[PDB]
């Protein structure tokens, strides 16, 4: 009985692999071969956002493209006016072990969580004028590795217990749990059209979920080590991954297979964060060796380097207007680059 | 020249003042990462010490101690252990009556790249009932390699030496102590260890060490 369906698991895996090789009539590097390189990406830190007293783990831009968030080991979740460096709020956490944070697409709320196995939603636009914890989203059995807002009432999260979950903030309950990673989940993001999302895990597999039904549509397994960072491509047809194997990899959802791997022989440390530029031409990757490298995504030609941190660059984000990239680090300072 | 946004700038300075105040308050406390096997006495040490991740705290000789029992995370340790880089010390403890899982965990902790310089306050717990064990089931039942007498002191010293043999970097010290389950002196052991650590860190800051 069970041996037969183990053999059937092998057979289905071979069917999937044969289909994937059947569709592999080209490799992205040889169809983009005629494209000119993007050139040198020269950039300078236009702001240094001092104020944290310990490791910065996560930051996230506001959709207004000017405000900003920062969660840190210092116990403060503080949000910035990136144009002026002014700290428009400073929020004390109930627990200081926060690994992730997110700014709501409207700006009315900001979320945060970590080793406390809880996602905390903070109401910023309060009548009393202060910032209040509006609900504690409890129910994960592992550290909250990542989180992102769908809308002011729906938030999806990635946990260190190998599950993602989508929450109803009004009731504070999981509307849909996404079981199916064998390792624990690390990073998460949303399709620009918002109907489906991908999640990376330590079993080196990234896979696509639909938010409504909760079924996995495809799984991607080209990595040799745990995947630390995930990011959808600006058009929702592809996504990029960062891993401890020191490579970033690009996957397309209708191709269902790896389109490119980003590597250079000198880099021997894992990626902690990743993002694209507004056009998707640049893949900006944050590495443990104290710098970010910007990859010509259509070429895998490394176009520039954002050096300037005294500790691991822990998080990375690009403004929704595409003007700037913010890099957070274990050095306790963000920097904003143009 | 700023418009009435000078009020927002003034708010920013007011924020910064309390960030600085809370930072000065927080640097005034000592952080201990608490580790060990299940039922080994991780909780018992603080239970005798007057009190997801669970932080525990108590004051002693005008130091404020915060002990984090991160062992509750049944998840990938390599992906969150770096949260505790820059704790003052590790309060690793083991139950003598148990074993080899403790030694494996101790080997992993001592030689982690994050804890390269972080000293370990090793507690060999349950030292009382370990006597009842050793008097009836010699240590060869757990270390068949034990070419020594079934005497109490040498057996305990052999276990201590086997734990300390996992230490591969000269630049850290292991403040091994035995807890005996009546305790009430564990706080003093931790205090002496953190006094040495605080002095050493001051010397690092001054360039003296």
């Amino acid at each position, epitope marked *: 009985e069970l041996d037969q369906l183990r053999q059937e698991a092998e057979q289905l895996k071979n069917q999937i692999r044969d289909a994937r090789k059947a569709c592999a009539d080209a490799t992205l590097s040889q169809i983009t071969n005629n494209i000119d390189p993007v050139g040198r990406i020269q950039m300078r830190t236009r702001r240094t956002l001092r104020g944290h007293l310990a490791k910065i783990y996560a930051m996230h831009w506001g959709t207004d493209s000017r*405000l900003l968030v920062s969660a840190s080991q210092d116990g403060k979740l503080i949000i910035w006016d990136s144009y002026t460096t002014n700290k428009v709020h400073a929020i004390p956490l109930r627990s200081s072990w926060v690994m992730t944070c997110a700014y709501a697409p409207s700006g009315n709320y900001v979320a945060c969580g970590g080793l406390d196995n809880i996602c905390s939603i903070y109401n910023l636009k309060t009548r009393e004028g202060n910032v209040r914890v509006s609900r504690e989203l409890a129910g994960h059995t592992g550290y909250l590795s990542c989180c992102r807002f769908l809308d002011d009432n729906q938030i999806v999260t990635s946990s260190g217990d190998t599950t993602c979950a989508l929450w109803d903030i009004e009731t504070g309950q999981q509307t849909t749990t996404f079981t199916g990673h064998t390792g624990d989940v690390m990073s998460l993001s949303l399709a620009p059209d918002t109907r489906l999302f991908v999640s990376g895990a330590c079993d080196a597999s990234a896979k696509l979920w639909d938010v409504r039904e909760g079924m996995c549509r495809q799984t991607f397994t080209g990595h040799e080590s745990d995947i630390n960072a995930i990011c959808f491509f600006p058009n929702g047809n592809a996504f990029a991954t960062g891993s401890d194997d020191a490579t970033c990899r690009l996957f397309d959802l209708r191709a269902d297979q790896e389109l490119m791997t980003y590597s250079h022989d000198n880099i021997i440390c894992g990626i902690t964060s990743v993002s694209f530029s507004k056009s998707g031409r640049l893949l900006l990757a944050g590495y443990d060796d104290f710098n970010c490298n910007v990859w010509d995504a259509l070429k895998a030609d490394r176009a520039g380097v954002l050096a300037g941190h005294d500790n691991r660059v822990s998080c990375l984000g690009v403004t929704d207007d595409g003007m700037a990239v913010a890099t957070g680090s274990w050095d306790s300072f963000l920097k904003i680059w143009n | 020249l700023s418009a009435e946004e000078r009020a927002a700038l003034e708010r920013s300075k007011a924020i910064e003042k309390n960030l600085k105040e809370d930072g000065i308050s927080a640097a005034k406390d000592v952080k201990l990462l608490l580790l060990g096997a299940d039922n080994s006495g991780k909780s018992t040490i603080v239970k005798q010490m007057k009190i997801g991740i669970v932080e525990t705290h108590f004051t002693f000789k005008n130091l404020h101690f915060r002990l984090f029992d991160v062992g509750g995370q049944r998840s990938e340790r390599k992906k969150w252990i770096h949260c505790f880089e820059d704790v003052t010390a590790i309060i690793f403890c083991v139950d003598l009556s148990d074993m080899h899982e403790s030694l494996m965990l101790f080997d992993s902790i001592c030689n982690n790249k994050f804890f390269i310089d972080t000293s370990i306050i090793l507690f060999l717990n349950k030292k009382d009932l370990f006597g009842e064990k050793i008097k009836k089931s010699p240590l060869t039942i757990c270390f068949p390699e034990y070419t020594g007498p079934n005497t109490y002191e040498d057996a305990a010293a052999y276990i201590q030496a086997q734990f300390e043999s996992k230490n591969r970097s000269p630049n850290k010290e292991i403040y091994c102590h035995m807890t005996c389950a009546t305790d009430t002196n564990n706080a003093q052991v931790i205090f002496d260890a953190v006094t040495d650590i605080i002095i050493a860190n001051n010397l690092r800051g001054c360039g003296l060490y």
Partner: single-chain antibody, 230 residues
């Protein structure tokens, strides 16, 4: 809920002194740079004083500087105005006003009940008419202009709109000429071109009739106040 409630009104002789106190409750008082503004018993609004959060900055109107002094007792959530050497021009009803300043905030977003005090280079705001008749269900346009352009170099233009229903304290409608205040129905919209401004009302409701004041915030002055009539 949020309250700014003042006390200490009454009669005084000219040349005397009196102190009025504002007991804030229901909101994080320490974080707000409260105000004080006043209304002559048959005239419009005017600005009196401003004490910031943490008392780091206080300003006054030139006609009151040196004679009044305002203090904030944060541990008691109480705002004070010590008025000394009163003059006949100082009789009015004084409103305790809320404010908090950060990117995207709404200053002047709440007002107290107010108390009566009766005695035995600035940018000036102008309004085109003192009153106009209206009917429910119609649409109307309020307008006012300033002696200097309120469009600051950063792109914001600092103009506010308030509506005093008869027998009620003012309420904020619009801030920086376009942002509708939280709680005001979407009947109201604002627009302008730096020096000239307007407030547009669509589908007017019978509960909307009152006086409309616009107020600049580019530098430390209300308009005269246009009054709608059913």
């Amino acid at each position: 809920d949020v309250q700014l409630v003042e006390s200490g009104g009454g009669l005084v002789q000219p040349g005397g002194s009196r102190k009025l106190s504002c007991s804030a409750s229901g909101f994080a008082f320490s974080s707000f740079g409260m105000h004080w503004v006043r209304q002559a018993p048959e005239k419009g609004l005017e600005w009196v004083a401003y004490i910031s959060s943490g008392s780091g900055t206080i300003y006054y109107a030139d006609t009151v500087k040196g004679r009044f002094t305002i203090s904030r007792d944060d541990p008691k959530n109480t705002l004070f105005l010590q008025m000394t050497s009163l003059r006949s021009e100082d009789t009015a009803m004084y409103y305790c006003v809320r404010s908090i300043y950060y990117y995207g905030s709404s200053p002047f977003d709440f007002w107290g009940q107010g108390t009566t005090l009766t005695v035995s280079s600035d940018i000036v705001m102008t309004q085109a008419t003192s009153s106009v008749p209206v009917t429910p269900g119609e649409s109307v346009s309020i307008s006012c202009r300033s002696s200097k352009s309120l469009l600051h170099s950063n792109g914001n233009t600092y103009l506010y709109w308030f509506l005093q229903r008869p027998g009620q304290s003012p309420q904020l409608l619009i801030y920086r000429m376009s942002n509708l205040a939280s709680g005001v129905p979407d009947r109201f919209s604002g627009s302008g071109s730096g020096t000239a401004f307007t407030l547009t009302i669509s589908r007017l409701e019978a509960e909307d009739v009152g006086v409309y004041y616009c107020m600049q915030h580019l530098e430390y002055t209300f308009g005269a106040g246009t009054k709608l009539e059913l």
